[PDB]
Amino acid sequence: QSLVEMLKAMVQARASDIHLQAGAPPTVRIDGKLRPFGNRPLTPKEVEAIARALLTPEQLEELEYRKEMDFAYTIPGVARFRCNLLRQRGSFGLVMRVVSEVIPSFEALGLPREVMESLAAKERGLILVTGPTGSGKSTTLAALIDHINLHYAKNIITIEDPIEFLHKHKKSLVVQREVGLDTDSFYTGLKYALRQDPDVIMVGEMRDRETVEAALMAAQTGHLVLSTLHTLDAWRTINRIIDFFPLHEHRQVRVLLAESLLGILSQRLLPKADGQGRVLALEILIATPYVRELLKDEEKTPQIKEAMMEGSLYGMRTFDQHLVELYTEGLISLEDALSAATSPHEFRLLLTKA
Numbered sequence: 001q002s003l004v005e006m007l008k009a010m011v012q013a014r015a016s017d018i019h020l021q022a023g024a025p026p027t028v029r030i031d032g033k034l035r036p037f038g039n040r041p042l043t044p045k046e047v048e049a050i051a052r053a054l055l056t057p058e059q060l061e062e063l064e065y066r067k068e069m070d071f072a073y074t075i076p077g078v079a080r081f082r083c084n085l086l087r088q089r090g091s092f093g094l095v096m097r098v099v100s101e102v103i104p105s106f107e108a109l110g111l112p113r114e115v116m117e118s119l120a121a122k123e124r125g126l127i128l129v130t131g132p133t134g135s136g137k138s139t140t141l142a143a144l145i146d147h148i149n150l151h152y153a154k155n156i157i158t159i160e161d162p163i164e165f166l167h168k169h170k171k172s173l174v175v176q177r178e179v180g181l182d183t184d185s186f187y188t189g190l191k192y193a194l195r196q197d198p199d200v201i202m203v204g205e206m207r208d209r210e211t212v213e214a215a216l217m218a219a220q221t222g223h224l225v226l227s228t229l230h231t232l233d234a235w236r237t238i239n240r241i242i243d244f245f246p247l248h249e250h251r252q253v254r255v256l257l258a259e260s261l262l263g264i265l266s267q268r269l270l271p272k273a274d275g276q277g278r279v280l281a282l283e284i285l286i287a288t289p290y291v292r293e294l295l296k297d298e299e300k301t302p303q304i305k306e307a308m309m310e311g312s313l314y315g316m317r318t319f320d321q322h323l324v325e326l327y328t329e330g331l332i333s334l335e336d337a338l339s340a341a342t343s344p345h346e347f348r349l350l351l352t353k354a
């Protein structure tokens with residue numbers, strides 16, 4: 001209706017998320033931030049009408065039996081949505097997520113092309129993209145899978161919760177399995193993927209020791225494995241993986257981690273200085289032979305910092321290094337650069353040398 005038109009306008013405004021809640025106006029999430037999309041508060045009556053307009057008649061009946069409902073909805077040639085209908089304070093609520101089929105380029109994402117293609121070219125090993133919710137981890141992964149799909153003839157199996165990007169077949173097969181629908185869990189998906197003749201396995205996130213170990217093993221075996229963790233940088237990411245295990249297993253885990261790791265890409269999305277959205281702060285650890293030593297040996301592991309700062313031949317760099325580069329280039333403010341810095345001290349030192 002007008003609904004379809006509003007949704008379409010919202011999507012064209014680059015809304016990642018649409019919130020329809022009684023007492024507020026239609027609200028969109030754009031570039032990570034919620035913004036109102038209209039000046040009039042939705043009434044309970046209006047939210048319900050929107051809901052009934054989106055559901056199939058069968059869905060409408062099962063709706064009277066559920067506190068919550070998760071469902072797909074498509075506006076042909078506009079967008080695909082996953083939708084969560086809820087109840088709050090006697091009233092229906094609606095949260096719609098756009099499933100995009102449009103994959104940004106490395107350059108669009110601020111991801112160094114040469115590094116990316118190098119990691120994509122490996123046919124064995126673990127690539128970890130880390131950071132908290134909203135860091136662009138899904139997106140880096142989607143760009144990385146897309147690159148593989150269009151230059152390599154491979155079987156790519158992804159296990160996702162939920163599917164954020166839809167890939168079409170190009171040069172590769174891309175098998176995408178949604179947790180809760182296609183497969184029960186990351187573990188279930190990872191496990192049976194081992195049986196489905198994959199070249200590339202993407203595990204959306206690792207929450208178990210079981211899943212972390214399985215993913216490492218899969219990488220050790222000879223598959224290319226992509227995954228994410230919530231951790232802020234390489235140092236924390238490495239330690240977090242090990243801390244998943246009982247203490248008596250830890251040097252086994254280092255051995256396992258050191259030999260199968262390829263790279264860690266830790267990400268933070270900072271507000272752009274001009275204010276035209278956001279920009280990626282990115283730390284790269286590449287698992288060179290020397291870096292593997294550092295990993296395998298607990299005493300030499302913090303020497304990962306120095307390795308990154310001098311590793312630009314590979315091309316590594318720390319957060320504090322990339323931030324300097326972003327600040328001097330006028331892509332972020334000094335305030336934002338300093339609040340983001342791993343150590344706001346080592347930043348100004350490093351900065352003064354430019």
Ligand SMILES: Nc1ncnc2c1ncn2[C@@H]1O[C@H](COP(=O)(O)OP(=O)(O)O)[C@@H](O)[C@H]1O
Pocket residue numbers: 016031032108109110111131132133134135136137138139140164269278279280
């Ligand atoms: N490299 C990037 N630069 C700017 N914005 C990005 C980048 N990657 C992702 N985004 C945006 O940030 C939002 C959240 O990204 P997402 O990939 O879902 O992060 P995560 O997987 O860490 O939650 C999305 O709206 C997306 O458009």
Ligand SMILES: [Cl-]
Pocket residue numbers: 022023088089091
């Ligand atoms: Cl309310």
